[PDB]
Amino acid sequence: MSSNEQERLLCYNGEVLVFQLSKGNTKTPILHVRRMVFDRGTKVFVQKSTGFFTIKEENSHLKIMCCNCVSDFRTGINLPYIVIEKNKKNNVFEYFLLILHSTNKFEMRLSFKLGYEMKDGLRVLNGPLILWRHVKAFFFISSQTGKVVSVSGNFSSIQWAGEIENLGMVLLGLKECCLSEEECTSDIYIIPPAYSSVVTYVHICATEILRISLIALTRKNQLISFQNGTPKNVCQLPFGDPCAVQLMDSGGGNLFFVVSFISNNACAVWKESFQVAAKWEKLSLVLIDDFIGSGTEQVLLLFKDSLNSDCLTSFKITDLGKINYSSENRYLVVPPLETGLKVCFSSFRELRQHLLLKEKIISKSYKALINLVQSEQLVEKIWYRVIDDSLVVGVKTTSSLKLSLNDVTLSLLMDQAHDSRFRLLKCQNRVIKLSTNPFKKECVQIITAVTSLSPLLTFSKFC
Amino acid sequence: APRVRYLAGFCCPLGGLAAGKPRVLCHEAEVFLSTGSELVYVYDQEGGLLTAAFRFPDQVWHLELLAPRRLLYALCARRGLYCLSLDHPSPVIPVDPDACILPDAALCAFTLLDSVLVTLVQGPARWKMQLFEQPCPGEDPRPGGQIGEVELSSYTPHFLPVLCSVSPSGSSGGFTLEDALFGLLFGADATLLQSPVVLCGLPDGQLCCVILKALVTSRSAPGDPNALVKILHHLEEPVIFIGALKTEPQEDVHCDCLVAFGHHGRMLAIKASWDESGKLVPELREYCLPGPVLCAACGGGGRVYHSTPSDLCVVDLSRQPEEGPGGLPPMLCPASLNICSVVSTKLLALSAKGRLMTCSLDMTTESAGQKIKELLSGIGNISERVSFLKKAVDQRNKALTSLNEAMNVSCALLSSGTGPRPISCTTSTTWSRLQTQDVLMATCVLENSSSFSLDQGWTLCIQVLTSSCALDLDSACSAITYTIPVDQLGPGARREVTLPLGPGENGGLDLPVTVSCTLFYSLREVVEQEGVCLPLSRHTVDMLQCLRF
Amino acid sequence: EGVEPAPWAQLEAPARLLLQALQAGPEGARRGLGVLRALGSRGWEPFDWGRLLEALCREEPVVQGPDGRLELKPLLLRLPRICQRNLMSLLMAVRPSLPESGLLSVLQI
Amino acid sequence: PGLAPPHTRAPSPLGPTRDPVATFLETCRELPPSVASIKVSAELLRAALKDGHSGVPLCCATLQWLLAENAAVDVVRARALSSIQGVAPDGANVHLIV
Amino acid sequence: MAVTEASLLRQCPLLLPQNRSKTVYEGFISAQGRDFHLRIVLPEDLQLKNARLLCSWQLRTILSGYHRIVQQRMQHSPDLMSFMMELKMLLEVALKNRQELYALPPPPQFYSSLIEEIGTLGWDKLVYADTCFSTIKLKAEDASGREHLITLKLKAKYPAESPDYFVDFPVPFCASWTPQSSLISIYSQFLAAIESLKAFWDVMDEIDEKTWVLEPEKPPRSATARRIALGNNVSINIEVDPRHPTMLPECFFLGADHVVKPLGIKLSRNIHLWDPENSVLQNLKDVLEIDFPARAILEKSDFTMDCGICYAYQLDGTIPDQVCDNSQCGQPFHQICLYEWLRGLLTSRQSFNIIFGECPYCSKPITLKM
Ligand SMILES: [Zn+2]
Ligand SMILES: [Zn+2]
């Protein structure tokens, strides 16, 4: 929440940090931190330490704008930040970036001091770095520079921000467009502009050489993979208005995309098979850390503030696996059951291996199949054009292939997963020999085929 | 009560921190850390606040530590090697280039012994191992003059090679063996001289040892390679980790078993046998584990603590000699790369996300009831996903058999049992009539005699070759090909197809015309370039069939 | 070379008495009884007949007739023939005191 | 095809499950048997089917006249079959009794 | 099929010929809802007299001590097909023996339903459950305030098939099992069986209170037999039919042949003066015209001072002489019996005119010097 008494939460290295502005009377409001932690013995959150920061000026309209970790550029060290607005009723808004250390004590870094109110896409980033908008005008204030700067390019929505290998910083707002946040401006292998209509938030996860194995989700309540913008493995989401994802890991392979929705609800979805594993409702908030000291991420669900005018009542912490914790003997039964859970776990983890073994033999067997039937590159390369209602396929030969000695052809074969039907597919075969700068010497022998289009264009597409 | 606890987490990239590079090192409660950026960190291990933070230039690649001397050695990548007094009169500190010693620049990897420094220097193709004195008196922290260089002639070029110290009993940042082993691996020279010996694993996976009594050389006195460096076992993948292990557990521990790792996870344990000849032989295995492996360590009593990128996993070697397989648990800690082991087991890390974290290893009324509630729900969570996986297993299995019928059909056809039993296709000619004109059609019957049901994945191509003898003028239409998917044919069952062969242009039909019928199986269709095409019949239509009376 | 341990070698010890006892010529059957009273007198006052009644039916592999023919024999036909004949005596002697489930599995064999 | 003389395996038609324009549209954007019958005077059918070919009066001779134009009338003359299950141009079955 | 072209495929789906010459198969073999790795090389000819076969370690563990079996099978099986048959049969055996390792149960039903049904019973009743949740054991109270236990063994699907029920009391227990029937149903049946044999128990209670019951010690609820000693150095065994307990029992007499006669005679005389309204003892005291002693010696009641093989004193002048060097057994034997016992066992080892070898009852080192 965002007010003079109103707080926000966050997570940091197992623990759940509570930032609370408090009207002090002698004076103006003060930041009070509670850094709280989960006992596991008592099944509650116990205060482990506190920090305060004394604010100066007798002016109102003091306001948290957001909270997260960052990593400072001097050290490298994930720090919890806070962004405070100070409004003097002066048509002036300060916007402090304040950092807290180990020490339950702070350090101001950017005052930043605008005249017009800040709103929309405020997202703080690595070298503690504030980037915002009004009317399609992006600006940023790095904590190196100290100075307000404008973004050169002109973009609509700025879905992703964050550091990558070789670049330092980046913005993806139009998926073609692939900036720097040094010298404002590869665009090559992103999601299709076909998606550009419907995508409303993004979340990369892996990057190599350019190739971005990435996720989205849409206005249509979908959720998608891409490996070089190749839309694999779509899920479907149960609620509307799907804001954002996180990731959670949860022990071996149990990796989920834990999605927050604008309708005060959330899901997890089970990567490995894009499937909704679970749905919660009313979710005042959600954070994703190992709150236990197991070494596997969990998730926290906070339920509504109608119950009590208090934060960490109505809570619920879980793995979506072994852990579920929350807010006439029976005992001889437990070591059975627990031991039971643990065996199925052994079964999950063992089938998981099992399946992959199967895959590997299968693959082993095609290659066995391919050497069963049986090096020299006989054909350079395939290409094709569309002429009007004519698909024209062709290729280039090499020396190796003597059309003198070998009648050759060139068929097409359709994919049956599309083509539910027996349409027979025909094609016409031509040889084209062209003499190449006759004014040894190069002949170009090319074999090529043709057939009709509107037969194939049954399913918007085929292979 | 928290078996795992957090101290501080860092500026990662996407993915997270790669392997080889980052290092963690614990002193007593003094701790040291390379995140493989330019920065080495120092932590109060009681309270995970930072004491001391250091900026180097360029990307720190490895550390070691001399406790007696109260010093830390810190390799910058393309520079040489910078040494720091730990008292060292913002909590951020640049090194000055003063603290520079041997700026060799071309050096990958280094270790320490006592009073000795062993570097490993990149060049052109031939890597050579260097060796310097290190001044035993508290002085200016000097290199000295090089005693020793040789060429790793074996070695001819991301993956930073690694070196290890191995001293035998009696004679420090390394490993002592038991004299039986020590003697078995290296031999008499080494044993006699109580020579501390240095093992280099290299990006290939090659694991070479060198005898430091024997590496003393000058301009007039060069290293021979073949003398001096020798090569133990060749893992065919880069090397993450070497140690030694006290199996048979019955501070200077006299290990019995030499441990190597690959990256893809051929690990290599080695032991003493003395078996069956009353003669010493080394028990080799080359087990073959899961995953990319991404850091390793040794901890109390024959237990290796290693990473996959899935999970932090652990092995036992403790109990012929050593063991058939090392089938192996996690402890359900995520991918930490960069691990260590202090012995009291309590091991320490840096989490692949960005996290510095410390693992400690080893009836009420109605909240027993809440326990029961929870435990069912856990299984209620798991069971679904188990079940998921079985159905996947079904697809896999069905597919193999689906393939199996393919292998059987293929094999039967490629055999000449002298009658094309399993699948046949007959072609035969039929004068039709169209719009006015008499046309020639070739009927193409596919007939299944055999059991095998030609499933989805299978597809027929026909190819209609004109005249052969390729011409002066390349014709309009060399040949035509028609292609159809065969579905579910079944045994006994059949398809017929009639084509045109006949004139539209010229009234012009020239012969022999031949129609070869053939089959492709699509591997992908059931779910390198990939299918299989298989050659059925090949029929000549000649001037006799195209007559009509 | 040709050591085989008795088929009841692996079993829980009191079986091993019962059937060790019933090996021994026609007074096998009393000796079986003798054992029952001698294990009402030792600390496992009960004897779990449902253990022994499974064990009997469960089959194991044998290769007999020629050198080569694989078969699956149950315990009952595999163990010593005099132990059969007396067992069966003893079971008329304590029929009431067994559960039906086991008996019927035995008989069918 | 079931009645057909040869009793030879000809593949079953199963014409296209959708129109190509229809398939196109569905993809880009994401029960009782019906009956009719007639009754008619035996005297009318008698007097009209007189020139009486041979054969059982009515039902079979009715069939010979309703398929007199179909090529497969003389096969039903031989088997003298009063009720059969033909196919169609649009691949659906249709059963006709007299 | 007849041929192992189609019969093989139909019986071993998941075994793929890698090679064209169908010589190398690899993949999986199926057994009991569970598919396992197998790698089966042939030579240049289709001969199992020489063939390679390796497993995953998961299978070799599961064909623990059938290794030699299967080598023999390879040399003396004709065909690959029949060899696979034999192998699958052979797995089925392995797993059906070691059924203690190999459950995944169907949790959604299983573990939840068990809590449901035990809740329906009530939480006082359960006494033991094994942690495989296989065995549960329950407690029932008589009108007479006597505890009787019931073992249930549960299968993979409890609610589908009958639980196996093991219980003490002496007539054969009957449980009407339906898939609709549950723990409470078998519970009711069990209470019915208690109340039915109620008289038999009151009779056995009465005996074990008023008299020097000797030969069962802490007698179970199973026992129908009660070897009473009476006066001294004479004893009567009394076996009572449970349905008609009060009815005259078969009874007969051990001790001095001189002392046995008049009692055996007076029984003959007085047997028609049996009555089933009075108790067994209140009929016996007035039939044999005697009293019994109320534990005449309660410490050295009787130690079966007998051979512990032949259960007789005086085997051919030999007494129960030969003993155990153990405080917990102390079981005498005879030289002859113990020699013919230990010499037969595999464990025992023979010195010159001595046998060291395990005491039959306690399996501790015992020595016999002929
Ligand atoms: Zn005796
Ligand atoms: Zn004993």
Tab-separated table of C-alpha atoms in Angstrom, chain E residues 40-349:
chain	number	residue	atom	x	y	z
E	40	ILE	CA	20.639	-58.241	-25.398
E	41	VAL	CA	23.421	-58.894	-27.955
E	42	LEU	CA	23.519	-61.959	-30.251
E	43	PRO	CA	26.553	-63.274	-32.157
E	44	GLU	CA	26.787	-63.459	-36.038
E	45	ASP	CA	24.231	-66.420	-35.817
E	46	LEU	CA	20.888	-66.567	-33.830
E	47	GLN	CA	22.336	-68.749	-31.040
E	48	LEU	CA	21.831	-68.118	-27.293
E	49	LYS	CA	24.597	-70.725	-26.543
E	50	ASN	CA	26.774	-67.571	-26.831
E	51	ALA	CA	24.838	-64.296	-26.188
E	52	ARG	CA	25.523	-61.101	-24.188
E	53	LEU	CA	22.910	-59.721	-21.855
E	54	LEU	CA	23.382	-56.817	-19.480
E	55	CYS	CA	20.937	-55.002	-17.227
E	56	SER	CA	20.614	-51.745	-15.480
E	57	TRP	CA	21.745	-52.244	-11.848
E	58	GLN	CA	18.012	-51.819	-10.996
E	59	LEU	CA	17.273	-55.186	-12.763
E	60	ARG	CA	20.473	-57.193	-11.529
E	61	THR	CA	19.461	-56.280	-7.886
E	62	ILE	CA	16.004	-57.624	-8.717
E	63	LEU	CA	17.475	-60.837	-10.214
E	64	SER	CA	19.555	-61.375	-7.095
E	65	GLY	CA	20.235	-65.159	-6.823
E	66	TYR	CA	18.565	-66.099	-10.147
E	67	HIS	CA	21.808	-65.135	-11.951
E	68	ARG	CA	22.996	-68.739	-12.357
E	69	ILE	CA	19.317	-69.655	-13.172
E	70	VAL	CA	19.218	-67.313	-16.123
E	71	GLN	CA	22.745	-68.313	-17.431
E	72	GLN	CA	21.452	-71.946	-17.481
E	73	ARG	CA	18.234	-70.748	-19.212
E	74	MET	CA	20.336	-68.980	-21.917
E	75	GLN	CA	22.315	-72.206	-22.714
E	76	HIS	CA	19.173	-74.480	-22.624
E	77	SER	CA	16.427	-72.145	-24.031
E	78	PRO	CA	15.896	-72.804	-27.791
E	79	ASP	CA	14.541	-69.417	-29.002
E	80	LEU	CA	14.804	-65.738	-28.031
E	81	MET	CA	10.937	-65.653	-27.706
E	82	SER	CA	10.705	-68.524	-25.147
E	83	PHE	CA	13.745	-67.018	-23.315
E	84	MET	CA	11.790	-63.710	-22.869
E	85	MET	CA	8.746	-65.633	-21.687
E	86	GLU	CA	10.941	-67.414	-19.065
E	87	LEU	CA	12.532	-64.091	-18.088
E	88	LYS	CA	9.117	-62.297	-17.542
E	89	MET	CA	7.831	-65.297	-15.544
E	90	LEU	CA	11.123	-65.055	-13.634
E	91	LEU	CA	10.591	-61.286	-12.825
E	92	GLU	CA	7.007	-61.861	-11.760
E	93	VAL	CA	8.429	-64.336	-9.212
E	94	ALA	CA	11.104	-61.928	-7.979
E	95	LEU	CA	8.676	-59.081	-7.312
E	96	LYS	CA	5.893	-61.311	-5.864
E	97	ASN	CA	8.520	-62.602	-3.366
E	98	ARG	CA	9.914	-59.131	-2.522
E	99	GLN	CA	6.445	-57.500	-2.403
E	100	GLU	CA	7.723	-55.385	0.677
E	101	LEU	CA	9.707	-52.930	-1.555
E	102	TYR	CA	7.250	-52.473	-4.544
E	103	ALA	CA	4.219	-50.290	-3.883
E	104	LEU	CA	3.402	-47.198	-5.202
E	105	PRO	CA	-0.119	-47.083	-3.642
E	106	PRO	CA	-2.836	-44.801	-5.153
E	107	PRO	CA	-2.638	-42.130	-2.462
E	108	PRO	CA	-5.741	-40.121	-3.424
E	109	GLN	CA	-7.914	-43.062	-2.369
E	110	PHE	CA	-5.600	-44.968	-0.076
E	111	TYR	CA	-4.006	-43.022	2.742
E	112	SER	CA	-7.009	-40.556	3.021
E	113	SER	CA	-9.704	-43.307	3.015
E	114	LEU	CA	-7.792	-45.171	5.741
E	115	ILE	CA	-7.987	-41.997	7.989
E	116	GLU	CA	-11.697	-41.591	7.090
E	117	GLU	CA	-12.485	-45.264	8.041
E	118	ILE	CA	-10.296	-45.314	11.209
E	119	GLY	CA	-12.084	-42.025	12.172
E	120	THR	CA	-15.433	-43.819	11.667
E	121	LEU	CA	-14.178	-46.571	14.082
E	122	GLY	CA	-12.686	-44.230	16.731
E	123	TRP	CA	-9.074	-43.507	17.680
E	124	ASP	CA	-8.794	-45.612	20.909
E	125	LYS	CA	-9.058	-48.890	18.891
E	126	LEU	CA	-5.895	-48.797	16.720
E	127	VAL	CA	-2.760	-50.071	18.464
E	128	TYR	CA	-0.097	-50.700	15.896
E	129	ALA	CA	0.304	-49.605	12.326
E	130	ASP	CA	3.501	-50.548	10.415
E	131	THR	CA	4.936	-47.426	8.616
E	132	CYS	CA	4.245	-49.117	5.132
E	133	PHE	CA	0.685	-48.759	6.508
E	134	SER	CA	0.242	-52.374	5.480
E	135	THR	CA	-0.459	-53.978	8.861
E	136	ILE	CA	-2.889	-52.340	11.223
E	137	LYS	CA	-3.871	-54.035	14.503
E	138	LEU	CA	-6.993	-53.296	16.478
E	139	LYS	CA	-8.328	-53.884	19.939
E	140	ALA	CA	-11.674	-55.162	21.075
E	141	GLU	CA	-13.251	-55.462	24.522
E	142	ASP	CA	-15.496	-58.349	25.682
E	143	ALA	CA	-18.520	-57.802	27.941
E	144	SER	CA	-16.113	-59.755	30.336
E	145	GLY	CA	-13.420	-56.984	29.972
E	146	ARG	CA	-10.908	-59.191	28.078
E	147	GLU	CA	-8.749	-57.753	25.257
E	148	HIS	CA	-8.689	-59.547	21.895
E	149	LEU	CA	-6.505	-58.333	19.008
E	150	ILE	CA	-7.101	-58.403	15.228
E	151	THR	CA	-4.353	-58.037	12.612
E	152	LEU	CA	-5.424	-56.704	9.187
E	153	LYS	CA	-2.993	-56.998	6.299
E	154	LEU	CA	-4.042	-54.477	3.546
E	155	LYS	CA	-3.264	-54.841	-0.178
E	156	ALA	CA	-2.355	-52.118	-2.689
E	157	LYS	CA	-6.157	-51.469	-3.028
E	158	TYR	CA	-7.718	-51.995	0.381
E	159	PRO	CA	-11.289	-51.047	-0.594
E	160	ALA	CA	-11.344	-53.199	-3.744
E	161	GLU	CA	-10.151	-56.605	-2.308
E	162	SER	CA	-10.541	-58.293	1.126
E	163	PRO	CA	-8.083	-57.370	3.845
E	164	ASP	CA	-6.409	-60.570	5.217
E	165	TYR	CA	-7.672	-60.856	8.860
E	166	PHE	CA	-5.534	-62.720	11.572
E	167	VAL	CA	-7.095	-63.227	14.994
E	168	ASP	CA	-6.671	-65.452	18.073
E	169	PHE	CA	-9.977	-67.175	18.981
E	170	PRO	CA	-10.240	-70.868	18.096
E	171	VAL	CA	-13.120	-71.363	15.448
E	172	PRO	CA	-12.462	-70.160	11.856
E	173	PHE	CA	-13.221	-66.396	11.493
E	174	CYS	CA	-15.678	-65.366	8.674
E	175	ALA	CA	-15.733	-61.798	7.246
E	176	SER	CA	-18.390	-60.981	4.570
E	177	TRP	CA	-16.209	-58.690	2.361
E	178	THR	CA	-17.895	-56.506	-0.314
E	179	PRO	CA	-16.147	-53.530	-2.047
E	180	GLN	CA	-18.842	-51.543	-0.096
E	181	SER	CA	-17.850	-53.187	3.251
E	182	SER	CA	-15.221	-51.380	5.379
E	183	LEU	CA	-13.445	-51.536	8.721
E	184	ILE	CA	-16.572	-50.929	10.801
E	185	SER	CA	-18.291	-53.912	9.031
E	186	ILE	CA	-15.386	-56.380	9.781
E	187	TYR	CA	-15.379	-54.691	13.376
E	188	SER	CA	-19.038	-55.642	13.965
E	189	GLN	CA	-18.355	-59.208	12.710
E	190	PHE	CA	-15.416	-59.405	15.145
E	191	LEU	CA	-17.564	-58.291	18.131
E	192	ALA	CA	-20.150	-60.966	17.062
E	193	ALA	CA	-17.444	-63.683	17.173
E	194	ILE	CA	-16.369	-62.420	20.716
E	195	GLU	CA	-19.848	-62.614	22.246
E	196	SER	CA	-20.435	-66.071	20.576
E	197	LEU	CA	-17.461	-67.922	22.220
E	198	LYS	CA	-18.188	-65.899	25.513
E	199	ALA	CA	-19.055	-69.191	27.457
E	200	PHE	CA	-15.791	-70.966	26.277
E	201	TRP	CA	-13.787	-67.984	27.717
E	202	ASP	CA	-15.730	-67.935	31.041
E	203	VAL	CA	-14.951	-71.690	31.294
E	204	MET	CA	-11.213	-71.221	30.470
E	205	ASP	CA	-11.083	-68.131	32.947
E	206	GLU	CA	-12.650	-70.296	35.713
E	207	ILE	CA	-10.089	-73.122	35.098
E	208	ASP	CA	-7.055	-70.785	34.969
E	209	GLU	CA	-8.221	-69.090	38.252
E	210	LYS	CA	-9.241	-72.035	40.494
E	211	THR	CA	-6.544	-74.565	39.412
E	212	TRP	CA	-2.920	-75.481	38.705
E	213	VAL	CA	-2.994	-75.039	34.941
E	214	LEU	CA	0.523	-76.227	34.032
E	215	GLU	CA	1.433	-76.739	30.341
E	216	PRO	CA	0.335	-73.421	28.727
E	217	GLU	CA	1.926	-70.484	30.564
E	218	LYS	CA	0.374	-67.101	30.057
E	219	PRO	CA	-1.986	-69.146	27.823
E	220	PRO	CA	-3.198	-67.377	24.640
E	221	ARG	CA	-6.913	-67.060	23.814
E	222	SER	CA	-6.190	-69.661	21.085
E	223	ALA	CA	-5.767	-72.636	23.410
E	224	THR	CA	-8.409	-75.345	23.886
E	225	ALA	CA	-5.964	-77.391	26.042
E	226	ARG	CA	-5.296	-77.184	29.810
E	227	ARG	CA	-2.875	-79.839	31.280
E	228	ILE	CA	-3.980	-79.661	34.984
E	229	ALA	CA	-1.638	-81.326	37.558
E	230	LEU	CA	-3.669	-82.424	40.677
E	231	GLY	CA	-2.416	-83.547	44.067
E	232	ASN	CA	1.284	-84.055	43.023
E	233	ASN	CA	3.182	-86.079	40.298
E	234	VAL	CA	-0.118	-86.834	38.418
E	235	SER	CA	-1.812	-84.659	35.638
E	236	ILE	CA	-4.939	-84.643	33.323
E	237	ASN	CA	-5.058	-82.911	29.840
E	238	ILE	CA	-8.703	-81.453	29.203
E	239	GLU	CA	-9.563	-80.408	25.543
E	240	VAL	CA	-12.878	-78.555	25.290
E	241	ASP	CA	-15.110	-78.099	22.234
E	242	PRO	CA	-15.783	-74.347	21.957
E	243	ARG	CA	-19.490	-74.385	20.726
E	244	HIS	CA	-20.510	-76.777	23.602
E	245	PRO	CA	-17.877	-75.903	26.241
E	246	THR	CA	-19.861	-76.908	29.342
E	247	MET	CA	-20.371	-80.344	27.580
E	248	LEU	CA	-18.137	-83.195	28.687
E	249	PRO	CA	-14.617	-82.896	27.344
E	250	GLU	CA	-12.235	-85.628	26.187
E	251	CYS	CA	-9.800	-85.864	29.121
E	252	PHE	CA	-6.901	-88.341	29.790
E	253	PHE	CA	-4.175	-88.961	32.417
E	254	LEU	CA	-0.359	-88.872	32.807
E	255	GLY	CA	1.666	-90.050	35.842
E	256	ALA	CA	1.964	-93.298	37.885
E	257	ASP	CA	0.221	-96.307	36.173
E	258	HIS	CA	-0.832	-97.514	39.704
E	259	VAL	CA	-2.453	-94.009	40.553
E	260	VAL	CA	-4.035	-93.593	37.036
E	261	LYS	CA	-6.198	-96.803	37.320
E	262	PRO	CA	-8.839	-95.886	40.066
E	263	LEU	CA	-9.355	-92.346	38.766
E	264	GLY	CA	-9.732	-93.874	35.146
E	265	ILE	CA	-12.244	-96.383	36.581
E	266	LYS	CA	-14.280	-93.800	38.709
E	267	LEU	CA	-14.458	-91.548	35.590
E	268	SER	CA	-15.966	-94.564	33.711
E	269	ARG	CA	-18.531	-94.943	36.616
E	270	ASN	CA	-19.416	-91.247	37.121
E	271	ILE	CA	-19.329	-89.986	33.454
E	272	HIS	CA	-23.213	-90.239	33.179
E	273	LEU	CA	-23.269	-87.798	36.191
E	274	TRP	CA	-21.948	-85.025	33.860
E	275	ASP	CA	-24.274	-82.000	33.611
E	276	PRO	CA	-24.007	-78.852	31.387
E	277	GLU	CA	-25.675	-76.312	33.910
E	278	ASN	CA	-22.806	-76.502	36.434
E	279	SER	CA	-19.219	-75.565	35.298
E	280	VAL	CA	-16.482	-77.982	34.045
E	281	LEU	CA	-14.827	-77.940	37.553
E	282	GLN	CA	-18.220	-78.196	39.411
E	283	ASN	CA	-18.895	-81.352	37.239
E	284	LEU	CA	-15.250	-82.693	37.603
E	285	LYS	CA	-14.993	-82.298	41.458
E	286	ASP	CA	-18.287	-84.337	41.917
E	287	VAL	CA	-17.482	-86.808	38.930
E	288	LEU	CA	-13.926	-87.800	40.040
E	289	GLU	CA	-15.052	-87.152	43.743
E	290	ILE	CA	-11.803	-85.129	44.449
E	291	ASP	CA	-10.424	-81.666	44.895
E	292	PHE	CA	-7.557	-80.259	42.812
E	293	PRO	CA	-4.643	-78.300	44.453
E	294	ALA	CA	-4.711	-74.423	43.938
E	295	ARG	CA	-1.112	-74.046	42.460
E	296	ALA	CA	0.525	-76.884	44.571
E	297	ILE	CA	3.915	-75.531	43.354
E	298	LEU	CA	3.673	-72.144	41.418
E	299	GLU	CA	7.566	-71.631	40.848
E	300	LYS	CA	8.858	-75.223	39.908
E	301	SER	CA	5.381	-76.197	38.632
E	302	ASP	CA	7.105	-78.344	36.034
E	303	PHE	CA	10.114	-77.730	33.723
E	304	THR	CA	9.642	-80.041	30.717
E	305	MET	CA	12.800	-81.927	31.755
E	306	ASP	CA	12.570	-83.513	28.458
E	307	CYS	CA	14.690	-84.009	25.324
E	308	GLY	CA	13.441	-80.913	23.441
E	309	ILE	CA	13.641	-82.991	20.238
E	310	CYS	CA	11.731	-86.184	21.155
E	311	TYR	CA	9.920	-84.614	24.169
E	312	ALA	CA	10.525	-87.843	26.148
E	313	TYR	CA	12.471	-88.701	29.277
E	314	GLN	CA	14.422	-91.898	29.177
E	315	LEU	CA	15.562	-92.407	25.572
E	316	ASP	CA	17.330	-95.845	25.913
E	317	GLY	CA	18.802	-95.133	29.425
E	318	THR	CA	19.977	-91.621	28.228
E	319	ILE	CA	18.229	-88.908	30.366
E	320	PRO	CA	17.868	-85.297	29.285
E	321	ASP	CA	21.521	-84.693	30.246
E	322	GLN	CA	23.136	-82.666	27.361
E	323	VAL	CA	22.159	-78.864	27.965
E	324	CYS	CA	22.663	-75.353	26.580
E	325	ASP	CA	25.448	-73.052	27.851
E	326	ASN	CA	22.817	-70.277	28.064
E	327	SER	CA	20.760	-68.695	30.865
E	328	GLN	CA	17.719	-68.088	28.578
E	329	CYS	CA	17.364	-71.609	27.052
E	330	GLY	CA	18.741	-74.169	29.552
E	331	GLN	CA	16.982	-76.782	27.393
E	332	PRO	CA	18.146	-80.381	27.985
E	333	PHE	CA	18.504	-82.743	25.222
E	334	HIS	CA	19.823	-86.246	24.609
E	335	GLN	CA	23.240	-87.106	23.071
E	336	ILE	CA	21.514	-89.052	20.271
E	337	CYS	CA	18.785	-86.523	19.449
E	338	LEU	CA	21.191	-83.554	19.549
E	339	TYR	CA	23.774	-85.429	17.428
E	340	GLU	CA	21.284	-86.274	14.691
E	341	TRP	CA	19.968	-82.633	14.849
E	342	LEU	CA	23.275	-80.688	14.602
E	343	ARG	CA	24.986	-83.145	12.146
E	344	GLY	CA	22.019	-82.514	9.738
E	345	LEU	CA	22.190	-78.698	9.981
E	346	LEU	CA	24.684	-76.865	7.608
E	347	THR	CA	25.811	-74.327	10.429
E	348	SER	CA	27.405	-76.901	12.815
E	349	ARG	CA	31.134	-77.930	12.459
